[PDB]
């Protein structure tokens, strides 16, 4: 549309496009997650719930391979039973909503695999810096 050619606009703007197009615009959805006599309690619990959710996400990233790299290749493989689709098709064919509907079952095992991979990389790096 207006943002054709130079593919960007405001946050949640890429939510309709395919995930390959939406992957180039991730900094703003990361950005619009933190900043934004009894009603002060409501304002305060909203603000601390926002920073608690953001800190939980940053801690979930920080125990994995990437602290703030925002795109992280890692060392765990991919079971093809989970996706069971053509690989380059999903980046030109699927929205992130539809993809999250697809792998709703296949969740929370990936995160433990990531933690095992990161702890294995840490003990391997400890051994490597130990014998040197």
């Amino acid at each position, epitope marked *: 549309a207006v943002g054709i050619g130079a593919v960007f606009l405001g946050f949640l703007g890429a939510a309709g496009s395919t995930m390959g197009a939406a992957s180039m615009t991730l900094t703003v959805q990361a950005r619009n997650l933190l900043s934004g006599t009894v009603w002060g309690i409501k304002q305060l619990q909203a603000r601390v719930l926002a920073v608690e959710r953001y800190l939980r996400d940053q801690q979930l990233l920080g125990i994995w391979g990437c602290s703030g790299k925002l795109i992280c290749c890692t060392n765990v493989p991919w079971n093809s039973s989970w996706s069971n689709r053509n690989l380059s098709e999903i980046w030109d064919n699927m929205t992130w909503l539809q993809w999250d509907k697809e792998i709703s079952n296949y969740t929370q095992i990936i995160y*433990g*695999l990531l*933690e*095992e991979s990161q702890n294995q990389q840490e003990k391997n790096e400890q051994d490597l810096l130990a014998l040197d």
Partner: antibody
Amino acid sequence: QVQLVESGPGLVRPSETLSLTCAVSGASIRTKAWWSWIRQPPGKGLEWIGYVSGGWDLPNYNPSLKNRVIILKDTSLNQFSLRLTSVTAADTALYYCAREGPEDFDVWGPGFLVTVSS
Amino acid sequence: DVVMTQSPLSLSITPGQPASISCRSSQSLVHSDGKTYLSWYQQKPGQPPRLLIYQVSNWYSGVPDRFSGSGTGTNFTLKISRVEAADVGVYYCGQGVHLPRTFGQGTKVDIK
């Protein structure tokens, strides 16, 4: 005082996805424990299928089960479920949910005969 | 994996007389702390088994002291110094120190 009770089929066709679910009362799931599945073919010895943990251990199975077993815990319902994809009629066995603790498998389930038949 | 063997495979008990099962594991079950993760079970038909002795010197809650257990290396020993009619079933020797968990074959025990 822990009580484990299995639930699910006992008669399924081969080459299908088998799934049981054991309910747990008398204690909590997220304990120093491995909520485990152990089977026994009829007239034969036991066969340990695998476990899951109430902490954050990754579940570790018997490699003879050919990576078709996914035990999934349900802490919001105090349960933990066996899975077995692509079953055969030779997989007919009594199934048991149990709890490894500081002692070895104190409270079992009653154990139900899953007779895989076509 | 760990291989378990019980000897004898069948022993019809004489009431008033002891009985024994020698367990043989394939590998050393003594963990580096100093303990031994070995357990004994007793098959009842269509039932969860009855549990006699875990961690050989230790005792289950719910087990009378008319049993006994010892052992060296991989040769462990369950003994019943006074058998009863309540000792029906087919026993088990099962390790717990190595993944994967394994169990045994068992000793057949009936009335003589």
